[PDB]
Design a protein around this ligand. Structure first.
Ligand SMILES: *[C@@H]1O[C@H](CO)[C@@H](O[C@@H]2O[C@H](CO)[C@@H](O[C@@H]3O[C@H](CO)[C@@H](O)[C@H](O[C@H]4O[C@H](CO)[C@@H](O)[C@H](O)[C@@H]4O)[C@@H]3O)[C@H](O)[C@H]2NC(C)=O)[C@H](O)[C@H]1NC(C)=O
Ligand SMILES: *[C@@H]1O[C@H](CO)[C@@H](O[C@@H]2O[C@H](CO)[C@@H](O[C@@H]3O[C@H](CO)[C@@H](O)[C@H](O[C@H]4O[C@H](CO)[C@@H](O)[C@H](O)[C@@H]4O)[C@@H]3O)[C@H](O)[C@H]2NC(C)=O)[C@H](O)[C@H]1NC(C)=O
Ligand SMILES: *[C@@H]1O[C@H](CO)[C@@H](O[C@@H]2O[C@H](CO)[C@@H](O)[C@H](O)[C@H]2NC(C)=O)[C@H](O)[C@H]1NC(C)=O
Ligand SMILES: *[C@@H]1O[C@H](CO)[C@@H](O[C@@H]2O[C@H](CO)[C@@H](O)[C@H](O)[C@H]2NC(C)=O)[C@H](O)[C@H]1NC(C)=O
Ligand SMILES: *[C@@H]1O[C@H](CO)[C@@H](O[C@@H]2O[C@H](CO)[C@@H](O)[C@H](O)[C@H]2NC(C)=O)[C@H](O)[C@H]1NC(C)=O
Ligand SMILES: *[C@@H]1O[C@H](CO)[C@@H](O[C@@H]2O[C@H](CO)[C@@H](O)[C@H](O)[C@H]2NC(C)=O)[C@H](O)[C@H]1NC(C)=O
Ligand SMILES: *[C@@H]1O[C@H](CO)[C@@H](O[C@@H]2O[C@H](CO)[C@@H](O)[C@H](O)[C@H]2NC(C)=O)[C@H](O)[C@H]1NC(C)=O
Ligand SMILES: *[C@@H]1O[C@H](CO)[C@@H](O[C@@H]2O[C@H](CO)[C@@H](O)[C@H](O)[C@H]2NC(C)=O)[C@H](O)[C@H]1NC(C)=O
Ligand SMILES: *[C@@H]1O[C@H](CO)[C@@H](O[C@@H]2O[C@H](CO)[C@@H](O)[C@H](O)[C@H]2NC(C)=O)[C@H](O)[C@H]1NC(C)=O
Ligand SMILES: *[C@@H]1O[C@H](CO)[C@@H](O)[C@H](O)[C@H]1NC(C)=O
Ligand SMILES: *[C@@H]1O[C@H](CO)[C@@H](O)[C@H](O)[C@H]1NC(C)=O
Ligand SMILES: *[C@@H]1O[C@H](CO)[C@@H](O)[C@H](O)[C@H]1NC(C)=O
Ligand SMILES: *[C@@H]1O[C@H](CO)[C@@H](O)[C@H](O)[C@H]1NC(C)=O
Ligand SMILES: *[C@@H]1O[C@H](CO)[C@@H](O)[C@H](O)[C@H]1NC(C)=O
Ligand SMILES: *[C@@H]1O[C@H](CO)[C@@H](O)[C@H](O)[C@H]1NC(C)=O
Ligand SMILES: *[C@@H]1O[C@H](CO)[C@@H](O)[C@H](O)[C@H]1NC(C)=O
Ligand SMILES: *[C@@H]1O[C@H](CO)[C@@H](O)[C@H](O)[C@H]1NC(C)=O
Ligand SMILES: *[C@@H]1O[C@H](CO)[C@@H](O)[C@H](O)[C@H]1NC(C)=O
Ligand SMILES: *[C@@H]1O[C@H](CO)[C@@H](O)[C@H](O)[C@H]1NC(C)=O
Ligand SMILES: *[C@@H]1O[C@H](CO)[C@@H](O)[C@H](O)[C@H]1NC(C)=O
Ligand SMILES: *[C@@H]1O[C@H](CO)[C@@H](O)[C@H](O)[C@H]1NC(C)=O
Ligand SMILES: *[C@@H]1O[C@H](CO)[C@@H](O)[C@H](O)[C@H]1NC(C)=O
Ligand SMILES: *[C@@H]1O[C@H](CO)[C@@H](O)[C@H](O)[C@H]1NC(C)=O
Ligand SMILES: *[C@@H]1O[C@H](CO)[C@@H](O)[C@H](O)[C@H]1NC(C)=O
Ligand SMILES: *[C@@H]1O[C@H](CO)[C@@H](O)[C@H](O)[C@H]1NC(C)=O
Ligand SMILES: *[C@@H]1O[C@H](CO)[C@@H](O)[C@H](O)[C@H]1NC(C)=O
Ligand SMILES: *[C@@H]1O[C@H](CO)[C@@H](O)[C@H](O)[C@H]1NC(C)=O
Ligand SMILES: *[C@@H]1O[C@H](CO)[C@@H](O)[C@H](O)[C@H]1NC(C)=O
Ligand SMILES: *[C@@H]1O[C@H](CO)[C@@H](O)[C@H](O)[C@H]1NC(C)=O
Ligand SMILES: *[C@@H]1O[C@H](CO)[C@@H](O)[C@H](O)[C@H]1NC(C)=O
Ligand SMILES: *[C@@H]1O[C@H](CO)[C@@H](O)[C@H](O)[C@H]1NC(C)=O
Ligand SMILES: *[C@@H]1O[C@H](CO)[C@@H](O)[C@H](O)[C@H]1NC(C)=O
Ligand SMILES: *[C@@H]1O[C@H](CO)[C@@H](O)[C@H](O)[C@H]1NC(C)=O
Lengths: 121, 432, 121, 121, 432
């Protein structure tokens, strides 16, 4: 089918089947420095996202189901609109202002279960 | 309810460092990544993206990269400091035509030798644009002597504008607008993702854009602000106009040793007759082309408006003329024969030649262009114009230029660089 | 015992007990650029393999058991020959032409179970 | 509360609730080389610790419960002293001489269960 | 059925960048990684690996690294441009022996001073190989004046060939072939993995290989193609031949200031008698050694074949003689006394000395070697030869050389660089 970003205009539930397509595309001394800086940055950006998935308990996954409830104030829409009408670019704009709140909540719930799992052992 | 996805097809505008790739150059040689013989392009269905060619930092990057590569290619070459001497000059009158009477000067001088103890008397030909009369009526100095050091370009490095492909680093992508009739700003449908840009030739010129790409359907007028007379108009042709340029003088070159391992390349006597350099533009083609340009200008200025073309305003030769580099020599051609009309064989444009070149718009770094032996003939495509509007029933357009960024903006207008942001969250209906 | 690559001449089942031995060995401005390029490359190569294990569902493991059947056309041998007679260098040559097919199948089966696991939650 | 290293003077069990605070802080050509070397090193150090957690079977976790018994010779103290009186800086000094022994044991027990888990499938 | 393993002991041939490590140098100083005091070597049981010393890119890398380090050590040193002047020269006849009559010249010249307004008359001794007669029968110039700029090596940086260890970057490994009687190509058993190479001394020489490693059991003959007379033969001895070289002239040095913070080091009058530089090779040792070489050549050419040794062919001094650098001075010794025999006290080889050195095989970068005070005595090991076969019942062997890669290929022949490929798949009997 289409490769990298081919699903960009597709709906969210049509997309999200192509997650490995995008994940794999994230990987004279003056020209040397410019190229190394570009390569070092690609590595650093990749690792920051991986660390973040790790602290949320989603390490090694592309689709991670969490234990944080959705607040209707973040987006009062049903699943039919979100997954069948909207694209990911549109969604990202709609909930931009709630991203940091959601991220904080994801970290907190992982810390709590990580500890509960120790008490049960 | 909250679920986390990684690998989501989302992006944001971004500014990054792009690297060069390509299939004895001034620019890209071995410090350039070999290209992919089968590069990818992915059409994005249902994607509308906003582009703005006037805010495209790929242009600023290219400008910086070509200047830096230019300097690195002069850094190891011969300094001509010993050449800034008093010259004793007379006129070249041997088989000289009227068109060049007084254009070439025969100058003698006392040059250094391999040995510090000895001097040599040598002579060479210079163009009048390369020298300044001082004081003794035959005494001259080179034009750059009171401004800057001058170096000689190494005569092994060509100036041929071999194309460069710009490629994005991982995590970034280049989006291309394929929408025909795209005027440089606003949204456009028909966006595709590419690994790299097409090959863009770093052709350096003023007034006329040479050897670039053509418009897909019709002549297009692009500007930052079409109603601002302080802004330039870039005109892209949908057909080329062929231009044939030449320096019809069989030159010879001589090497003067000036030191232990260094030599100056001087112009020797001209073989045969001495005639003026010039460029030929087919008149009918130019007239048809200009036809199309006016038809499109009227869309912005009125279809009952009188549109006049006029030659350039006064100022520095590097701006008022059509500058280009072909065959290894720098030409300054007079375009008043192209821009002289109300509304809308061959047209011959006389040209001047210089050996001492101040590149870009810098002061302090001059270069000497070694002469080229034999006769130079160039054939190239005019692919567009840079116009400035002079300004209640008529408008006057004149040739403009000198800011090299306008010559790259015309090729990079289709590209945008974005950053990929693979994480996202959404509601779903599952629970860890 | 022997360290890095010590098991190279050992059979596949004698080897594969030394996986941590090899895994741990993967980690004037001109000399600066040459050394940084070597270091940056080592990092990039390491991360590409880790990303690949991740999309196959083998993150964090040295021995990962998958859900893709073996096609006898890739190598018609029994377990006795593969694990007791052959070395890993010999095996790699034998199935070189099927590596990309196998990798594609591993990615596909992970995508399918990753989705099934969401539907079950 | 306090951010990076804020818990440094806290007891071990008061600390160890702040693990994400510290984990997130680990991420002219001559100046170019100096800065790149600093950035490349930060990446390499991060990855070595992640590889090590991986071979111990603790990938993706901040608190990992293992299957290696504690030898009283490493530290003959009860849980009350270790978790309620001591700080992590003090603890690190107390058991510095046993760190490599413990690390070797953690690798070995993971290799054994990684293999047992294959036999059970 | 499919299972995935990570950490699999598999490798492929690869080309990468190796870094230098080591335990006022030209080469490795502080830009070199300190070595491991207890380096590892792991024997690989049951591993057969194919090696090819003639396709080993470690050789190309070493060649590039040593040239670049060489240049970086001359870059900050004094330029001798002011020295390329007309010299007034006479002969040194004071206590001169017959062997050197006409070899040294006493030259006077007008040199610059710290102050731009003043000149000084100075004199120094030069070897005849450093100067060219011009025109006035006493007028000379330095040999490099019509070719290249010359710089003076800084007399604080020694040329002693301190050993360099090459180490692989992570993800790569160096395999060593320990198979005795390994001729450079084909498979070999007894392969081990090492972190780094042993220390290899960047000794620069022609014809005779000095101070290298020895063969483990017997003299070995190695070539790319033993039947191709266009290829060189590398001969590795299993025993050293000791060679003692000297410059028996008590020289003195004088410093001539040539500018504000710069000085030229000149050779002053020689103290005592003036005698020819030479090298001594024990005759019996050489004869036994040559014995062993022929016995082995016969394995490829026939045991009833007549093998003759002859001196070098004509050509540039740098090739036809045995060049080496010892004590800080560059010697060019005549080896016709070593290669003059059919089949198979001391042998004295006369030598010439030069001050102006064109390194490697480059043109454009010359260096001046400051003179060394006192008397130079060197003791070194001949560890092998570079031979060329001149070619129906006999073969003639002559000394060869000049291509420095042949001097490193002789030490790096045991090493191969491979890339580790840790992933692999195999059938097993389990199911996720
Ligand atoms: C617009 O594009 C056209 C073509 O796409 C381009 O014209 C080309 O210019 C080059 C350079 O002037 C021409 O190539 C030269 O042709 C002459 C013919 O006698 C040769 O002598 C030249 O070779 C010498 O110089 C070389 C420099 O490295 C040396 O390597 C060589 O040994 C010789 O010394 C050289 O081949 C080329 O033929 C034309 N192309 C065509 C189709 O005519 C034009 O210049 C571009 N316009 C601009 C303004 O850049
Ligand atoms: C083959 O290997 C042998 C040894 O392995 C090597 O011989 C060594 O050469 C060096 C350099 O010629 C000798 O060291 C010198 O000895 C003289 C003796 O009077 C000293 O004066 C020298 O010191 C001066 O120069 C130094 C340079 O940095 C200064 O730092 C110092 O202050 C002095 O100015 C210096 O010590 C060394 O002794 C011999 N070794 C032996 C055993 O004789 C030989 O050259 C190698 N062959 C080749 C061709 O490289
Ligand atoms: C430029 O001037 C030089 C002299 O400075 C001319 O060269 C001389 O031409 C005459 C013609 O017979 C010769 O006899 C001389 O020997 C030439 N002088 C040298 C130094 O060669 C030269 O021809 C003039 N060139 C032009 C184009 O007028
Ligand atoms: C460019 O070419 C034109 C055409 O040859 C030159 O035009 C001449 O300019 C002088 C200046 O007053 C006029 O008197 C002539 O009548 C003009 N000729 C024509 C046909 O118009 C023009 O000067 C050239 N420009 C430059 C800068 O040299
Ligand atoms: C001037 O423009 C024409 C038209 O674009 C160029 O000729 C085309 O070159 C492409 C190269 O693949 C061919 O596919 C086209 O078929 C050509 N068109 C025609 C009509 O032949 C021409 O090469 C350009 N000239 C220069 C000097 O670049
Ligand atoms: C620099 O000067 C030397 C010495 O005159 C030139 O080398 C001589 O070239 C002639 C050409 O026929 C030979 O016959 C001589 O034997 C050469 N002499 C030596 C010592 O080799 C050299 O060619 C000159 N270099 C340049 C660039 O002109
Ligand atoms: C090289 O020539 C110089 C002169 O150019 C000789 O130096 C002179 O030697 C006489 C001997 O009594 C002294 O009186 C002079 O004062 C010396 N001149 C200078 C400038 O010192 C020098 O000895 C010659 N060297 C050789 C080796 O012959
Ligand atoms: C190298 O040394 C040998 C031996 O001293 C020199 O050989 C002499 O060469 C001349 C040239 O014709 C002969 O006439 C002599 O008879 C040779 N002597 C002997 C003993 O054979 C040789 O010339 C030297 N090589 C160089 C390049 O100087
Ligand atoms: C010439 O070769 C001999 C033989 O390899 C070198 O002497 C050996 O040096 C090693 C260094 O560890 C000792 O272990 C050997 O026992 C030495 N052999 C003998 C017979 O003593 C000698 O140093 C070499 N000479 C030079 C100048 O490198
Ligand atoms: C949902 O968000 C609002 C503010 O946007 C907050 O007051 C409310 O408590 C949130 N719901 C829950 C369950 O926390
Ligand atoms: C739920 O889906 C229906 C589909 O028509 C839509 O009209 C309704 O507004 C959706 N719910 C919300 C909260 O918007
Ligand atoms: C002009 O050209 C002719 C062509 O042969 C030549 O003979 C004549 O000498 C030239 N005139 C001068 C002054 O060089
Ligand atoms: C050269 O020609 C120009 C043309 O105007 C004239 O003015 C000048 O005096 C001439 N120079 C000589 C040296 O004759
Ligand atoms: C060269 O130097 C001499 C010295 O007398 C002078 O006469 C002559 O005019 C100089 N040559 C030139 C072209 O200035
Ligand atoms: C370019 O197209 C956009 C599309 O809306 C339009 O707004 C803009 O004014 C156009 N540019 C000019 C110079 O008219
Ligand atoms: C275009 O130029 C006119 C000239 O004054 C200016 O008023 C107008 O605001 C400019 N357009 C924009 C979009 O700023
Ligand atoms: C340019 O030269 C070509 C032949 O090379 C010729 O056909 C064409 O008409 C010329 N153009 C002009 C404007 O003379
Ligand atoms: C433009 O044409 C006029 C005609 O009089 C001329 O005077 C002027 O110098 C020309 N300008 C340029 C830059 O050629
Ligand atoms: C410009 O057009 C006028 C119209 O009469 C013509 O006379 C003049 O020569 C033209 N100028 C040029 C430079 O061709
Ligand atoms: C230039 O003159 C030389 C003289 O023989 C001739 O051979 C050469 O072909 C001429 N060059 C051209 C381009 O006509
Ligand atoms: C096994 O491979 C063959 C081709 O090599 C293919 O046709 C066959 O369908 C494969 N088996 C399965 C179960 O897909
Ligand atoms: C199975 O193992 C036996 C052992 O002798 C071997 O002969 C047989 O060929 C193997 N099976 C296959 C498919 O090769
Ligand atoms: C505990 O450590 C001691 C040495 O410090 C060792 O002898 C003992 O066997 C260890 N305990 C176990 C269970 O291995
Ligand atoms: C256990 O805790 C008590 C608390 O007072 C302490 O006294 C005792 O020494 C601890 N055990 C060990 C092994 O130190
Ligand atoms: C030759 O050496 C002796 C040794 O004392 C010395 O006296 C004599 O002057 C020297 N000869 C010359 C010409 O220097
Ligand atoms: C120097 O000695 C050589 C030996 O052949 C002789 O030819 C030369 O003329 C001598 N030079 C002087 C200046 O006497
Ligand atoms: C130094 O310059 C003077 C100036 O008259 C000259 O006579 C003398 O010969 C020069 N010296 C040399 C060695 O050339
Ligand atoms: C080196 O050994 C290999 C081993 O087979 C042999 O094929 C090759 O010909 C030998 N080299 C020479 C020069 O004989
Ligand atoms: C060795 O050299 C001979 C000389 O012609 C050639 O025929 C032979 O093919 C060469 N050997 C190889 C392996 O190419
Ligand atoms: C070299 O010198 C040593 C003593 O340092 C001596 O024993 C040896 O025989 C000499 N070699 C020759 C060839 O003279
Ligand atoms: C080799 O020996 C011969 C003997 O006649 C001699 O002529 C020749 O110059 C010598 N060659 C070299 C390079 O020494
Ligand atoms: C070479 O051997 C011959 C044999 O007669 C001898 O006369 C000659 O002097 C030798 N040459 C050298 C340079 O020793
Ligand atoms: C060189 O001569 C000086 C003069 O006193 C003496 O002291 C020194 O030892 C001599 N050098 C040698 C190596 O004999």
């Amino acid at each position: 089918f289409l490769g990298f970003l081919g699903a960009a205009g597709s709906t969210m539930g049509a997309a999200s089947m192509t997650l490995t397509v995008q994940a794999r595309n994230l990987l004279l001394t003056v020209w040397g420095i410019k190229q190394l800086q570009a390569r070092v940055l690609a590595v650093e950006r990749y690792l920051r996202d991986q660390q973040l998935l790790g602290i949320w308990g989603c390490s090694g996954k592309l689709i991670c189901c969490t234990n944080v409830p959705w607040n209707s104030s973040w987006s009062n829409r049903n699943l039919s609109e979100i997954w069948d009408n909207m694209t990911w670019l549109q969604w990202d704009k709609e909930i931009s202002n709630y991203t940091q709140i959601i991220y904080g909540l994801l970290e907190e719930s992982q810390n709590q279960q990580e500890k509960n799992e120790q008490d049960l052992l | 309810w909250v679920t986390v996805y990684y690998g989501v097809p989302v992006w944001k505008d971004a500014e990054t460092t792009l690297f060069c790739a390509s299939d004895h150059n001034v620019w890209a040689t071995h410090a350039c990544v070999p290209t992919d013989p089968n590069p990818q392009e992915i059409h994005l269905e249902n994607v509308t993206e906003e582009f703005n060619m006037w805010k495209n930092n790929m242009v600023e990057q290219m400008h910086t990269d070509i200047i830096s590569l230019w300097d690195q290619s002069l850094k190891p070459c011969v300094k001509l400091t010993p050449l800034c001497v008093t010259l004793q000059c007379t006129n070249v009158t041997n088989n000289i035509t009227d068109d060049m009477r007084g254009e070439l000067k025969n100058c003698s001088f006392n040059m250094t030798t391999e040995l510090r103890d000895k001097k040599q008397k040598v002579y060479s030909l210079f163009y009048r644009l390369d020298v300044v009369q001082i004081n003794s009526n035959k005494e001259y100095r080179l034009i750059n002597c009171n401004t800057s050091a001058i170096t000689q370009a190494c005569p092994k490095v060509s100036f041929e504008p071999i194309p460069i492909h710009y490629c994005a680093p991982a995590g970034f992508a280049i989006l291309k607008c394929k929408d025909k009739k795209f005027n440089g700003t606003g949204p456009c449908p028909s966006v595709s993702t590419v690994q790299c840009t097409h090959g863009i030739k770093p052709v350096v010129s003023t007034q006329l854009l040479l050897n670039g790409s053509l418009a897909e359907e019709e002549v297009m007028i692009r500007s930052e602000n079409i109603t601002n007379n302080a802004k330039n108009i870039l005109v892209q042709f949908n057909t080329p106009v062929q231009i044939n340029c030449t320096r019809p003088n069989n030159n010879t070159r001589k090497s003067i040793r000036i030191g232990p391992g260094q030599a100056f390349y001087a112009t020797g006597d001209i073989i045969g007759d001495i005639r003026q350099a010039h460029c030929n533009v087919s008149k009918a083609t130019w007239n048809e082309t200009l036809g199309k340009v006016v038809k499109q200008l009227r869309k912005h200025f009125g279809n009952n408006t009188i549109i006049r073309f006029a030659n350039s305003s006064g100022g520095d030769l590097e701006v008022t003329t059509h500058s280009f580099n072909c065959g290894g020599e720098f030409f300054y051609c007079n375009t008043s024969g192209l821009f002289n009309s109300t509304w809308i064989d061959s047209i011959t444009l006389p040209c001047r030649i210089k050996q001492i070149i101040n590149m870009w718009q810098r002061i302090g770094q001059a270069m000497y262009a070694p002469p080229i032996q034999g006769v130079i003939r160039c054939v190239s495509n005019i692919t567009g114009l840079i116009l400035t509007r002079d300004g209640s029933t008529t408008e006057t357009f004149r040739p403009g230029g000198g800011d090299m960024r306008d010559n790259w903006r015309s090729e990079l207008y289709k590209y945008k660089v974005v950053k990929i942001e693979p994480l996202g969250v959404a509601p779903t209906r599952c629970k860890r």
